[PDB]
């Protein structure tokens, strides 16, 4: 089960 | 035994016409259960293990949705990173990302981690405290300050410590018959005559799961790290692994060499000799 894209881009 | 759930993302830019290649694979210990390939027909997250095929459409719509959202974040990254490294638009570049959570035998959280890479080298990684970041280059430090502002570590910790370990425990009981089962190595030795006065003694460990195995050779009771050839553990292609350890022995003295096999599914380690 994946997390969402809380990751901003670099 | 302990367990882990991990995701591996590989985005590779194809400068010239379209989009990057984005591969995403998910693993529970050494069993892969899902994948997404940017160039696959479906454009969905696919089952790669039987015990996940029985998941709901809603699961598959959620996971397809998240993984391609993740794809686009990486597409912006290859350009931004190229900017950070003042690179041309002619060369292909690769971004890799890996995150996951480890659970103990109690199924109570151990570690969480997230590491990111550019062109096969470290770029930025979450530290073992799930609070701070290791930035490699000065570019990686600009990313650190962005993620520091956007509070990525606080969100990511909640994932590693919450919904990762939860859904991991779930996978474990749902695919119990495979996942919670330790396949012990099927050992055996072979002997090839290298010459009239020397022989290779090769100790095998086959069809074992998990991949962790310590294959060790020794002579008269003491370790034989010398004249040992040890190959890296390889997949058999059915989900089990294989490995061998070989030692060059002077003829007539094979009796003093013992191979020692340690693996999670052996109550006591194996000691096998040639006679």
């Amino acid at each position: 089960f994946l997390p969402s894209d809380f990751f901003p881009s670099v | 035994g302990s367990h882990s759930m991990r995701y591996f993302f590989t985005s590779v830019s194809r400068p010239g016409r379209g989009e990057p290649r984005f591969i995403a694979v998910g693993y529970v210990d050494d069993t892969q259960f899902v994948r997404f390939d940017s160039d696959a027909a479906s454009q969905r997250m696919e089952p790669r293990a039987p015990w996940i095929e029985q998941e709901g459409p809603e699961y598959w719509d959620g996971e397809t949705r998240k993984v391609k959202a993740h794809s686009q974040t990486h597409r912006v990254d290859l350009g931004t990173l190229r900017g950070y490294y003042n690179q041309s638009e002619a060369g292909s570049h690769t971004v890799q990302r890996m995150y996951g959570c480890d659970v103990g035998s109690d199924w109570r959280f151990l570690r969480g981690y997230h590491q990111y890479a550019y062109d096969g080298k470290d770029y930025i990684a979450l530290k073992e405290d799930l609070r701070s970041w290791t930035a490699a280059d000065m570019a990686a430090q600009t990313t650190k300050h962005k993620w520091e502002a956007a509070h990525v570590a606080e969100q990511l910790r909640a994932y590693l410590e919450g919904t990762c370990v939860e859904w991991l425990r779930r996978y474990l009981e749902n695919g119990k018959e495979t996942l919670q089962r330790t396949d012990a190595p099927k050992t055996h030795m072979t002997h090839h005559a290298v010459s009239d006065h020397e022989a290779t003694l090769r100790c095998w460990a086959l069809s074992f799961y998990p991949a962790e195995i310590t294959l060790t050779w020794q002579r008269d009771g003491e370790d034989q790290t010398q004249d040992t050839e040890l190959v890296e553990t390889r997949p058999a292609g059915d989900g089990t692994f294989q490995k061998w350890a070989a030692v060059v022995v002077p003829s007539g003295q094979e009796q003093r060499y013992t191979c020692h096999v340690q693996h999670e599914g052996l109550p006591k380690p194996l000691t096998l000799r040639w006679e």
Binding site: - | T10, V12, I23, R48, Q96, M98, R234, D238
Partner: protein, 100 residues
């Protein structure tokens, strides 16, 4: 940028017995970038139906792939894997030995 050459192992899934079907595997690992050509050969000729695992990598960021095909071994038939990557000047071919 980083370029590390593929480690290559050619072997069978199960112990190799003549007349019994098996799978010929070629495991390429430790390479970077992901662009690699891996072919399995029977007496020099390229086997047509060769499948492989989904791209995954190790902790030091190197990639690994497992290429496989069904094959029934014989004693007279010679099988091998041909791998090509930027790190190679000319393709690295390694022969399948039933004792490795």
């Amino acid at each position: 940028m980083i370029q590390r050459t593929p480690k290559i192992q050619v072997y069978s899934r199960h112990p190799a017995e003549n007349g019994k079907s098996n799978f010929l595997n070629c495991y390429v690992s430790g390479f970077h970038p992901s662009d690699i050509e891996v072919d399995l050969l029977k007496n020099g000729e390229r086997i047509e139906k060769v499948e492989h695992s989904d791209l995954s990598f190790s902790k030091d960021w190197s990639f690994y792939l497992l290429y496989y095909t069904e094959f029934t071994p014989t004693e007279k038939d010679e099988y091998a894997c041909r791998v090509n990557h930027v790190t190679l000047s000319q393709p690295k071919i390694v022969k399948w030995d039933r004792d490795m």
